[PDB]
Amino acid sequence: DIVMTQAAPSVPVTPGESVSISCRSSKSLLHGNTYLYWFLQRPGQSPQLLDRFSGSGSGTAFTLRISRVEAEDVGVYYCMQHLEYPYTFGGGTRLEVKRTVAAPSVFIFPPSDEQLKSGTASVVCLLNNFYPREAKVQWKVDNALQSGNSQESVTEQDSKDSTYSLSSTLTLSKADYEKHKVYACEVTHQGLSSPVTKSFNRG
Amino acid sequence: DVQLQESGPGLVKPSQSLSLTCSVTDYSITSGYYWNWIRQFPGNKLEWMGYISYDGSNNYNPSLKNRISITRDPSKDQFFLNLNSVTTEDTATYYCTRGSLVWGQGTLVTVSAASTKGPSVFPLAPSGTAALGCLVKDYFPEPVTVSWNSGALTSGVHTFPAVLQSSGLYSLSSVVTVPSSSLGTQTYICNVNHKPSNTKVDKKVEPK
């Protein structure tokens, strides 16, 4: 079995600049021809086989060079040997665009009446199109700080603008939801001079 | 042009057999090429499983040789993967391919004793632009797909990754940014599809 190694799990790059993704094989991939493929996988999609992209290298050491990286190049890059069965892949390298700071637009959503028939109330805070990825979300119920009952989920880097978005979900019982009035999401992030709070009054 | 379409359950029970069908369109599987099954583990690692060639010859990854079978039906233009005695470690996204160039869309197969369950869909109601969405809760196994207005509205859409809740059921939200002036005159519906249970849920999202 040929083992394919990609030592960098990710590579940062400024848009417009160039980047190299490296791959190594435990056994030479020459027979003049070189039996090495490169794939890009965009989030949610099957891998796709790969003018700005160019491949180079010897028999055990390979390089995918991406010239003038665009926001649209983000995703995971894999090499594959097709010299001998079984065909084997490297573990992949994520291309991460480093862009300028961008502050999130914050939105809060109350539990729907439909959900409230169930005895559970989900309260959702949304942070749209921000950079960098790190952000702090805090929930308060009647100004009391919530702990242990919220969950954050974040998108992969946006193909268009190199940002991330994040949902924070507060899960509470209906009874706990009905006894309180004020629901607030407090967001701290690099592009905000002051923490942003979005809130609603129950009903 | 040539396309590959996968079908089969998104859920298989531990110790039982996993079966998947690849339906090939606009090409005959006997004419040429090698027809592969490849799978992607959670965490992105890709593994070539085996192939059936244009002439019906097989080649399997030694890691699997005792459990795998790739077979075909030339007149339906399909080939098939069978994997016996699956464990939790066979949970993966399964791809069929023609060579390295043409891939099927992929089907996630979760190895679990639990039953399928369709999602509940709740509006995320908007309170110059506004965000709105759908909370898609309590389904198993992954995935759901979310579209908006039957695929007419695509720009400004974020559909977050599923998170497995403590109950053992997945949850996610899909949001879209929308003109705040259109909130009373435009209809926004999220179309949720949960293929594993063959369930579609459409939900109209209205301002509060």
Side-chain angles (χ1 to χ4, degrees), chain A residues 104 106-109 123-127 134-153 166-172 182-189 192 194-200:
Chain A
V106 185
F107 304 95
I108 188 168
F109 302 104
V123 194
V124 177
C125 188
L126 171 69
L127 287 64
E134 189 189 290
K136 188 181 182 179
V137 178
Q138 290 177 302
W139 286 93
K140 286 155 181 180
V141 171
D142 281 336
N143 200 15
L145 194 149
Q146 300 306 290
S147 214
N149 50 347
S150 63
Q151 288 172 25
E152 286 71 61
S153 171
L166 179 153
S167 73
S168 179
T169 308
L170 185 66
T171 303
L172 35 183
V182 189
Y183 296 85
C185 176
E186 183 181 315
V187 175
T188 314
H189 178 92
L192 304 158
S194 181
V196 165
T197 294
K198 283 280 142 82
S199 60
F200 71 82

Side-chain angles (χ1 to χ4, degrees), chain B residues 2-36:
Chain B
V2 52
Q3 69 183 67
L4 273 60
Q5 285 170 237
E6 327 192 20
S7 60
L11 180 68
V12 173
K13 286 153 150 25
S15 87
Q16 295 182 193
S17 294
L18 178 158
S19 299
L20 253 28
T21 296
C22 187
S23 299
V24 181
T25 280
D26 294 0
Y27 199 90
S28 180
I29 61 167
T30 59
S31 168
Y33 293 93
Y34 291 82
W35 304 83
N36 306 278

Side-chain angles (χ1 to χ4, degrees), chain B residues 85-159:
Chain B
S85 304
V86 301
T87 77
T88 304
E89 306 148 84
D90 294 309
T91 291
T93 302
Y94 286 80
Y95 296 102
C96 60
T97 82
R98 191 190 74 182
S100 297
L101 186 58
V102 181
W103 293 64
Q105 84 283 7
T107 149
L108 176 55
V109 181
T110 301
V111 177
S112 172
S115 295
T116 67
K117 183 193 181 309
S120 292
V121 187
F122 306 121
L124 299 163
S127 298
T129 59
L132 53 81
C134 278
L135 168 67
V136 185
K137 220 185 145 269
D138 307 324
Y139 63 94
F140 186 85
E142 296 175 302
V144 289
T145 61
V146 193
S147 74
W148 284 91
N149 297 351
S150 311
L153 176 62
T154 47
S155 215
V157 169
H158 298 307
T159 298

